[PDB]
């Protein structure tokens, strides 16, 4: 459902790597003291250890990430490719957020885990390619944004957000709001003459171009032939 000028190549981070690398980047443990958040990044570090009503949410997050890993690896991208054209560029969003709110001095982060998890969940339930309370509308809406949700969940993971990007609450709210608005801006407009645009986008490259290739092969394809060269 997206306009073709609005998408940029982005890496899907849940796809590549070994299971150990996946586990180290994304899996958090609350009871386990060492494999938890590094204490020197958050205000509430001491309150974290040993909790259960939060390790449940962390496990739910990690299982969603494993679901995305399995889905992308077995259904969508079986050959491992993870650099694909997608809507809003999140690296640029994150770096702009870092620039505006001055994320230096490694300050204690006031951004709690449950707030991160619920923010990403609400965002994933706020990307509207189709609007309507119908049931086929809901199914098509979730099928439309599955890959982009996979990207947003592979990037805005709790360990990554807290350690690698060190965002606070203000930067977090800004990143989420910007993702809503820029995704709403990435959608194709009704009324687009996608057929003429597609025809020109296919024909123009032909002006610059023992397997048959190039213009004769494209002519064979478009002039559907019962036999080919």
């Amino acid at each position: 459902g997206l306009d073709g000028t609005q998408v940029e190549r982005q890496t899907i981070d849940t796809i590549p790597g070994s299971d150990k690398a996946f586990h180290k980047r994304y899996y958090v443990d609350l009871m386990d003291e060492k494999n938890s958040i590094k204490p020197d990044v958050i205000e509430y570090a001491a309150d974290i250890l040993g909790d259960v009503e939060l390790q449940k949410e962390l496990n739910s997050e990690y299982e969603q990430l494993v679901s995305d890993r399995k889905f992308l690896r077995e259904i969508v991208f079986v050959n491992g490719d993870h650099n694909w054209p997608l809507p809003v560029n999140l690296r640029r969003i994150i770096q702009n957020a870092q620039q505006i709110f001055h994320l230096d001095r490694a300050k204690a982060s006031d951004l709690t885990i449950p707030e991160i998890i619920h923010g990403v969940r609400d965002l994933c339930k706020k990307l509207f390619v189709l609007r309507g309370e119908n049931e086929l509308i809901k199914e098509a809406q979730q099928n439309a944004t599955s890959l982009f949700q996979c990207l947003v969940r592979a990037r805005l993971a709790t360990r990554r957000i807290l350690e690698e990007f060190r965002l606070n609450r203000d930067a977090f709210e800004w990143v989420l709001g910007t993702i809503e608005a820029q995704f709403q801006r990435s959608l194709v407009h009704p009324g687009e003459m996608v057929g003429v645009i597609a025809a020109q986008s296919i024909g123009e490259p032909a002006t610059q171009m023992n397997v048959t290739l190039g213009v004769p092969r494209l002519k064979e394809i478009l002039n559907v032939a019962k036999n080919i060269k």
């Binding site: 073709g4 020109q200 986008s201």
Partner: protein, 519 residues
């Protein structure tokens, strides 16, 4: 607004309904019967009424009006006549379908050879598409060689029992081979006999083959009266100030009239059967080549210059025909063309426009209470000084040309009036280089007026146009209203096309000396 007031409401065409013209309606919409071939009266000043230049057909002169509608040359559409034929003839563009219907139907009683009794045809009837239904009924009904009177006690379907002929086509003559029971006596099927057979088809029978009761009746595919187009469709021309030759259609109609009269000179006296066929076939050939002069396997109706006649079909087809040469694309006013040049000092969405072109082209700007001082300054300046103006349009359409008007100082601009001022700085204009392979080959630029008759382009936009400065010329189109100005500036503007949907990457970059210099 350049059309004189008419009281009917103006609306737009939502539906087009094609179909044949019946002889009754052809006679009805006509305005004068055409029978005399000779163009002029006797070379005698306002030619013979009932000829091909009857003033009832309409006016093609600037100082004469139409005797049918009483309107000037600008408004009169032209008016059709009719010209009854002595014998009916085939429409050249329907002979194959006449042959198909002849094969499908019973050529004696006007009934479909097979009924709904046979379930194959009973389901072939059940196609909604007229063409698919016609194909599915013809692909079955074409082989039964009798009109069985009993549906497969004796129950009669009303049929007759006469055998069917094996239709064949040889030119414009429809042969039908009757294999009696040996020697199959093959006879010629004239247009009149087929017309008589076709008039007998019942409305429901007509529906099954896929025709229409109101719009397309199978006998209207045979011509019995011919419409004569107005002279607008076949205007004369002037070669050296005193001479005129008629258009091809006019001479073709004259030849048809000669053929018709020769036909009417045979059924009135001796005619030993080898002149009736010859002259009726001459009529058939003239009528055929009046509509289609590209008929396979026969000579072409020629001009005495040796060229073939420009038939209507040849008028309608091709790159230069009506559809592709005048409807899909056409020549337009308010355009300019000249060589392009590069200017490092122009902005990306700026184009440098020569002064002479800026004064030749114009934009109509409605007078309002925010631009009245500026427009009156333009009116005083005149059409030879920049910034000036070329025309003033009054609230009823009367033009005030500011060239021949000697008293340019004594014009006060009214509100709601329109001034066709010059081309000025920052006007959005559509700018274009051929070939226009993609949507970014034609983009809207802001105007900057300059001397030195080339067009000026910022050098980063030469990539989407695929242009360079070694001879190239580019076209400039000026929007003549505010809707088109807004459309250009908000959809086609150069800044909006920097990123392309072809490969979701930019198409304009830094090029050709700025790149080397920045390195």
């Amino acid at each position: 607004s350049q059309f004189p007031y008419s009281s009917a409401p103006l609306r737009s065409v939502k539906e087009v309904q094609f179909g044949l013209l019946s002889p009754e309606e052809i006679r009805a919409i006509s305005v004068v019967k055409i029978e005399y071939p000779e163009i002029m009266d006797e070379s005698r000043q306002r030619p013979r009424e009932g000829g091909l230049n009857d003033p009832k057909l309409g006016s093609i002169d600037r100082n004469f009006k139409c005797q049918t509608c009483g309107e000037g040359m600008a408004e009169c559409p032209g008016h059709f006549g009719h010209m009854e034929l002595a014998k009916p003839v085939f429409h050249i563009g329907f002979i194959p379908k006449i042959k198909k219907v002849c094969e499908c139907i019973c050529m004696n009683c006007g009934k479909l050879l097979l009924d709904e009794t046979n379930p194959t045809m009973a389901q072939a009837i059940r196609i909604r598409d007229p063409k698919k239904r016609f194909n599915a009924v013809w692909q079955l009904c074409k082989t039964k060689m009798v009109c069985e009177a009993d549906a497969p006690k004796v129950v009669s379907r009303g049929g007759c029992g006469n055998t069917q002929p094996v239709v064949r086509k040889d030119g414009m003559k429809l042969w039908g081979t009757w294999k009696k029971s040996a020697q199959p006596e093959r006879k010629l099927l004239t247009p009149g006999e087929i017309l008589n057979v076709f008039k007998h088809i019942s409305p429901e029978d007509c529906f099954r083959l896929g025709f229409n009761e109101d719009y397309a009746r199978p006998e209207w595919m045979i011509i019995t009266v011919l419409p004569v187009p107005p002279p607008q469709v076949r205007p004369s021309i002037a070669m050296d100030e005193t001479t005129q030759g008629q258009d091809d259609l006019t001479h073709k109609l004259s030849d048809i009239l000669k053929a018709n009269i020769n036909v009417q000179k045979l059924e009135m006296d001796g005619s030993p059967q080898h002149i009736i066929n010859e002259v009726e076939q001459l009529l058939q050939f003239h009528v055929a080549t009046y509509m289609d002069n590209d008929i396979a396997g026969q000579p072409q109706a020629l001009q005495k210059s040796g060229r073939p006649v420009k038939a209507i079909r040849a008028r309608l087809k091709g790159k230069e025909g009506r559809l592709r040469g005048n409807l899909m694309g056409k020549r337009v006013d308010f355009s300019a063309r000249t060589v392009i040049s590069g200017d490092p000092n122009l902005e990306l969405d700026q184009v440098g426009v020569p002064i002479s072109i800026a004064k030749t082209l114009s934009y109509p700007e409605t007078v309002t209470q925010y631009n009245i001082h500026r427009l009156t300054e333009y009116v005083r300046n005149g059409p030879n000084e920049h910034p000036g103006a070329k025309y003033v349009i009054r609230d009823n359409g009367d033009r005030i040309d500011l060239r021949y008007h000697k008293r340019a100082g004594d014009i006060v601009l009214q509100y709601g009036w329109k001034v066709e001022r010059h081309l000025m700085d920052d006007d959005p204009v559509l700018f274009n280089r051929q070939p226009s392979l993609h949507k970014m080959s034609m983009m809207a630029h802001r105007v900057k007026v300059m001397p030195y008759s080339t067009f000026r382009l910022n050098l980063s936009v030469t990539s989407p146009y695929n242009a360079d400065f070694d001879g190239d010329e580019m076209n400039l189109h000026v929007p003549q209203s505010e809707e088109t100005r807004a459309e250009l500036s908000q959809l086609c503007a150069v800044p909006l096309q920097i990123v392309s949907p072809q490969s979701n990457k930019p198409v304009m970059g830094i090029v050709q000396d700025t790149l080397c210099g920045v390195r």
